[PDB]
Amino acid sequence: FQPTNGVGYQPYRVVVLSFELLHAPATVCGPKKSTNLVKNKCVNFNFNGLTGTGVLTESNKKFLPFQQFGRDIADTTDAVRDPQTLEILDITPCSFGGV
């Protein structure tokens, strides 16, 4: 390796990234992007696995330090903790009515 060598004989540092998938749980993933919050609007949400549709507003309840989301007595998602602000946001179904 001399500094006067042309293209072809110069040292080229090459790295190899080998991806392996086994029966073990997936530990390395891609960076999951995050969007801004919005209040008092009918908007679909997706925090961890919850794919619903409703209006997110500030709540007055307090979850446990490990409980992510909650649900009402009717087995329907009622509130969910924000994964970044650690705040509880109520989930209310959007306006459903007949004309």
Binding site: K61, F63, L64, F66, Q67, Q68, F69, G70, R71, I73, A79
Partner: peptide, 11 residues
């Protein structure tokens, strides 16, 4: 113990 991370109150 807590079987899941779901919040339930008075149920």
């Amino acid at each position: 113990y807590y079987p899941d991370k779901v919040f339930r109150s008075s149920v």
